Amino acid sequence: IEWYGPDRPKFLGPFSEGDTPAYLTGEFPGDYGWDTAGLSADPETFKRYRELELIHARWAMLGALGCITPELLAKNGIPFGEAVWFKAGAQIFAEGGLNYLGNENLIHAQSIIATLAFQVVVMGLAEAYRANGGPLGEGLDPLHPGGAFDPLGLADDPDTFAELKVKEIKNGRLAMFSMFGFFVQAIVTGKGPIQNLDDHLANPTAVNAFAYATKFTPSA
Amino acid sequence: EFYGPNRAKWLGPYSENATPAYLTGEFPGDYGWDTAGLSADPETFKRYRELELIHARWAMLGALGCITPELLAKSGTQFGEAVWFKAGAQIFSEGGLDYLGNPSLVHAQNIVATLAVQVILMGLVEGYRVNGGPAGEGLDPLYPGESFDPLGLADDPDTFAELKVKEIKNGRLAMFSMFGFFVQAIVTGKGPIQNLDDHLSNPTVNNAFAFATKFTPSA
Amino acid sequence: KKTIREKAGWWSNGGNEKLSAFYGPDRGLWLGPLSGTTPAYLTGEFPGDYGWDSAGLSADPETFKRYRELELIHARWAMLGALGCITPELLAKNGTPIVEPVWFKAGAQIFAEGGLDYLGNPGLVHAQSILATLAVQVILMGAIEGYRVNGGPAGEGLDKLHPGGQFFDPLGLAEDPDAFAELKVKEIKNGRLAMFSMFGFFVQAIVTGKGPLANLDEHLASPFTSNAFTYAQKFTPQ
Numbered sequence: 171i172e173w174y175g176p177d178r179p180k181f182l183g184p185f186s187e188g189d190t191p192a193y194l195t196g197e198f199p200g201d202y203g204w205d206t207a208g209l210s211a212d213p214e215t216f217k218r219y220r221e222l223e224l225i226h227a228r229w230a231m232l233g234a235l236g237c238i239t240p241e242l243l244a245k246n247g248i249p250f251g252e253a254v255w256f257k258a259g260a261q262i263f264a265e266g267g268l269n270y271l272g273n274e275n276l277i278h279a280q281s282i283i284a285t286l287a288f289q290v291v292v293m294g295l296a297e298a299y300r301a302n303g304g305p306l307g308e309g310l311d312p313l314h315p316g317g318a319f320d321p322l323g324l325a326d327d328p329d330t331f332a333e334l335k336v337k338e339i340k341n342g343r344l345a346m347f348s349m350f351g352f353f354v355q356a357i358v359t360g361k362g363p364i365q366n367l368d369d370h371l372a373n374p375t376a377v378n379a380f381a382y383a384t385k386f387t388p389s390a
Numbered sequence: 391e392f393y394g395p396n397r398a399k400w401l402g403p404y405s406e407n408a409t410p411a412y413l414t415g416e417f418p419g420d421y422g423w424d425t426a427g428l429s430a431d432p433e434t435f436k437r438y439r440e441l442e443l444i445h446a447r448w449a450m451l452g453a454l455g456c457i458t459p460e461l462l463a464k465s466g467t468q469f470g471e472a473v474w475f476k477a478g479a480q481i482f483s484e485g486g487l488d489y490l491g492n493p494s495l496v497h498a499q500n501i502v503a504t505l506a507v508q509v510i511l512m513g514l515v516e517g518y519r520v521n522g523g524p525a526g527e528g529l530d531p532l533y534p535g536e537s538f539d540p541l542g543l544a545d546d547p548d549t550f551a552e553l554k555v556k557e558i559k560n561g562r563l564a565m566f567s568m569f570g571f572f573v574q575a576i577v578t579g580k581g582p583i584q585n586l587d588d589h590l591s592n593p594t595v596n597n598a599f600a601f602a603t604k605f606t607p608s609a
Numbered sequence: 610k611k612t613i614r615e616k617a618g619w620w621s622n623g624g625n626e627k628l629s630a631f632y633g634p635d636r637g638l639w640l641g642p643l644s645g646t647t648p649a650y651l652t653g654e655f656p657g658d659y660g661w662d663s664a665g666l667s668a669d670p671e672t673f674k675r676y677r678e679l680e681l682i683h684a685r686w687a688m689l690g691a692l693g694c695i696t697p698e699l700l701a702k703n704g705t706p707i708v709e710p711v712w713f714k715a716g717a718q719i720f721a722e723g724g725l726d727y728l729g730n731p732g733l734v735h736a737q738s739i740l741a742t743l744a745v746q747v748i749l750m751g752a753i754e755g756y757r758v759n760g761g762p763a764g765e766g767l768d769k770l771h772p773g774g775q776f777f778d779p780l781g782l783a784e785d786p787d788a789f790a791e792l793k794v795k796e797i798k799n800g801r802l803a804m805f806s807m808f809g810f811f812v813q814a815i816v817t818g819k820g821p822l823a824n825l826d827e828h829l830a831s832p833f834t835s836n837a838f839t840y841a842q843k844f845t846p847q
């Protein structure tokens with residue numbers, strides 16, 4: 171499987187000879203030929219959208235792992251005052267604050283405003299450095315800088331670099347899809363992802379999403 | 391400067407390599423913020439500039455119109471419904487929508503006639519805005535002047551430029567603030583001035599995070 | 610300059626100035642006589658060109674093409690949907706025993722243990738499994754749309770929007786190029802009306818909570834009494 175060039179894998183498979191636009195040359199990772207809406211016809215808008223895709227992908231991978239991990243650790247024994255991810259933020263308003271792994275001695279956060287303030291300070295610093303560089307880079311690539319972000323050195327060969335780019339963007343698209351799912355099915359179900367999987371495995375035919383289909387009907 | 395390459399930018403010192411090649415410091419409010427690349431085409435850029443400025447002007451008027459009645463409300467006027475996100479439901483009251491509380495001023499009773507007159511006049515004026523009319527055959531689509539400058543503030547090009555920047559910046563501020571009005575009316579259910587009063591009463595406890603667990607599904 | 614019967618619209622097959630109101634420079638525009646400077650890329654060559662690109666989203670010709678295809682496909686789906694969201698309710702108020710004719714509740718019929726009888730007749734489709742329904746549908750519509758986007762058993766070297774072979778123009782209504790050109794406009798206009806009315810169905814569901822024909826009926830009962838402003842205070846933030 172090629173992942174590049176004209177004979178690359180495409181998002182409709184065999185159905186995909188004449189659907190791909192002329193501007194989606196197999197140059198960039200994850201180019202399956204999906205621009206039915208034509209939103210990436212301009213190469214500059216295409217570059218900006220590629221950056222958005224990759225950053226959303228990386229953030230979504232981190233977030234998928236961060237929503238899965240505490241729940242797994244929650245049933246595997248560990249105290250998690252609020253393990254479910256869509257209420258993990260409301261721990262600040264509890265009696266003992268947000269203890270990290272349940273340990274009252276680890277972080278013991280009590281004020282959300284100070285937490286948020288530090289977060290804006292350092293996130294702004296880091297994202298500005300990401301845009302225009304800084305202590306970990308001056309004129310590197312906006313997406314794959316390397317140097318300080320390859321302490322292991324996985325991608326010094328261009329072919330390994332390309333295949334790992336594809337792997338990155340695909341795990342990331344998977345994570346973005348899965349995070350969208352987390353959102354919609356938290357709103358719909360009101361339970362965690364792991365508990366949704368457990369319930370689906372307990373009764374797959376009558377514990378699926380269609381059980382929550384008549385939930386949002388107006389009914390006067 | 392607010393123009394040219396050495397202009398103020400959206401990330402300040404960390405903004406040298408964060409601006410696209412097409413965002414030359416030609417147009418007001420160009421801080422170099424097109425991370426999404428939505429204005430790469432100059433024509434789409436022009437249309438988006440018009441949308442920005444019109445949203446800005448409408449949002450300035452609306453910000454003033456949501457702040458003013460509430461101020462006047464505690465300052466001593468009754469205002470059957472002073473809060474802005476229920477100011478429209480006055481038509482369904484007993485005496486209709488009295489402007490400053492005065493039953494003698496407007497005394498509107500029918501919302502469909504109000505709306506009909508509004509569509510009439512608004513369509514006429516917005517079509518005149520797009521292609522001109524009694525107040526301008528072929529003037530700039532954004533800064534026509536010549537009847538929209540009875541005071542004559544912007545006959546000098548430099549004053550014109552700086553007032554353009556002031557306009558678009560007050561307008562971006564108002565658009566941000568109007569978005570805030572929306573989200574925090576939906577979240578809080580109270581007016582903007584009352585939200586400020588409550589924040590000033592106890593800033594550390596009745597900020598937005600007090601309403602954070604409001605939209606949790608909880609099965 | 611003409612005679613009475615040509616003014617009255619007689620003599621079909623006199624149509625080359627009747628495309629002038631839907632194609633070309635001096636056509637009908639989105640604000641009519643109050644839309645002067647149409648976007649230069651909206652030259653009047655495509656059906657439904659009223660000069661409306663206020664947001665400049667179709668400035669690139671290729672994304673304009675993609676948006677045209679999106680528009681027409683949405684239009685066709687919305688026409689089918691607008692017809693299908695009113696046919697069951699009309700048929701039920703005429704007397705067909707449909708168990709839930711309201712469209713935003715029509716999907717919940719498959720969870721009743723009598724199944725999803727089509728016209729309320731158990732001898733008909735009688736679907737019980739929503740998952741099997743969805744699987745059948747996914748297989749069929751995937752094949753169908755993949756055939757649409759590149760070609761398939763119903764013609765491969767055809768247009769992406771108006772294939773018009775013997776499978777999609779089997780009545781030959783569009784063999785006259787002028788009839789074709791004006792039928793394109795009729796298609797896109799009925800379809801834009803259907804898309805607007807389907808947005809209306811969606812909003813009238815989320816807001817009103819009744820059926821669309823029920824809304825029509827309660828509006829025709831006493832219009833000024835009952836309107837969309839009746840439900841204006843419904844989304845009050847409490």
Ligand code: CHL
Pocket residue numbers: 179180181182183184185202343746747751752755
């Ligand atoms: C030939 C068979 C084949 C078919 C039919 C498809 C079809 C698809 N592939 Mg694809 N692929 C196929 C082969 C292959 N794919 C891929 C690799 C990929 C990738 C990497 C991706 C795809 C994606 C897609 C999707 C893009 C179209 C879309 O977004 O649907 C849009 C239409 C719908 C979503 C309609 C909904 C369908 C369903 C009936 C929904 C149910 C309706 C709900 C009840 C409605 C809810 C009600 C609400 C409103 C209240 C689509 C499902 C993309 C994707 O996953 O996006 C989603 C994508 O990223 N494919 C490979 C490897 C080379 C293939 C090998 O042959």
Ligand code: CHL
Pocket residue numbers: 289290294295298398399400401402403404421562
């Ligand atoms: C070097 C420091 C510096 C930093 C970090 C920034 C940062 C920013 N400036 Mg900038 N500026 C900076 C210097 C300067 N600025 C300006 C002039 C301007 C202007 C005129 C504007 C900006 C704007 C912006 C923002 C654009 C990116 C954005 O939209 O945020 C995106 C990132 C976030 C929104 C993160 C949010 C943080 C927080 C954690 C969110 C909370 C999460 C929620 C709880 C989750 C939501 C819950 C959901 C589920 C409901 C960004 C915050 C723009 C702006 O105000 O947009 C908002 C803007 O219009 N700046 C000048 C004058 C020359 C500067 C001088 O140094």
Ligand code: CLA
Pocket residue numbers: 347348350351352354355358359365366367369370377378379380382740743744747
């Ligand atoms: C790969 C990602 C992924 C995975 C593994 C799951 C897994 C699950 N989801 Mg989530 N979900 C996802 C993505 C995902 N979802 C996305 C993207 C959305 C937004 C559309 C949702 C929205 C959603 C809702 C609203 C609900 C679930 C629910 C569920 C559970 C029951 C399955 C169900 O009802 O299907 C629903 C699946 C979807 C709506 C779309 C996902 C599309 C899949 C990945 C592709 C089809 C694969 C499938 C095996 C092929 C079936 C063919 C045919 C039958 C159609 C199950 C644990 C339900 C739950 O909590 O039950 C306990 C529930 O209420 N999900």
Ligand SMILES: CC1=C[C@H](O)CC(C)(C)[C@H]1/C=C/C(C)=C/C=C/C(C)=C/C=C/C=C(C)/C=C/C=C(C)/C=C/C1=C(C)C[C@H](O)CC1(C)C
Pocket residue numbers: 204205206207208209226227229230231232233234235236237254255256257258259345346347349350
């Ligand atoms: C391609 C194409 C083509 C054509 O042309 C057009 C179109 C169609 C348009 C296109 C498409 C597109 C799409 C589909 C998109 C999607 C997106 C997404 C899903 C995202 C996500 C995204 C996602 C994401 C970011 C995510 C993220 C996450 C995160 C951060 C997390 C966080 C967290 C966590 C951990 C948990 C805790 O407790 C808390 C919090 C804080 C919560």
Ligand SMILES: CC1=C[C@H](O)CC(C)(C)[C@H]1/C=C/C(C)=C/C=C/C(C)=C/C=C/C=C(C)/C=C/C=C(C)/C=C/C1=C(C)C[C@H](O)CC1(C)C
Pocket residue numbers: 423424425426427428445446448449450451452453454455456473474475476477478564565566568569
């Ligand atoms: C720049 C950029 C860049 C990159 O690239 C991309 C992106 C990101 C996309 C971008 C961004 C954008 C944005 C942010 C936007 C925003 C907007 C807004 C906020 C608006 C508002 C807007 C706003 C507005 C209009 C407002 C308005 C208002 C009004 C009318 C008012 C009215 C009223 C009032 C008085 C009150 C009373 O009782 C009633 C009423 C009737 C209610």
Ligand SMILES: CC1=C[C@H](O)CC(C)(C)[C@H]1/C=C/C(C)=C/C=C/C(C)=C/C=C/C=C(C)/C=C/C=C(C)/C=C/C1=C(C)C[C@H](O)CC1(C)C
Pocket residue numbers: 661662663664665666683684686687688689690691692693694711712713715716803804805807808
């Ligand atoms: C032009 C322009 C210009 C400037 O520049 C910019 C702008 C403004 C942006 C633009 C505009 C645009 C627009 C307006 C759009 C719209 C759209 C729509 C409305 C769609 C719908 C759309 C719609 C649609 C698809 C619909 C569809 C439907 C359907 C499928 C149905 C289905 C069904 C039925 C039968 C019933 C049953 O029981 C169920 C169901 C399942 C429900």
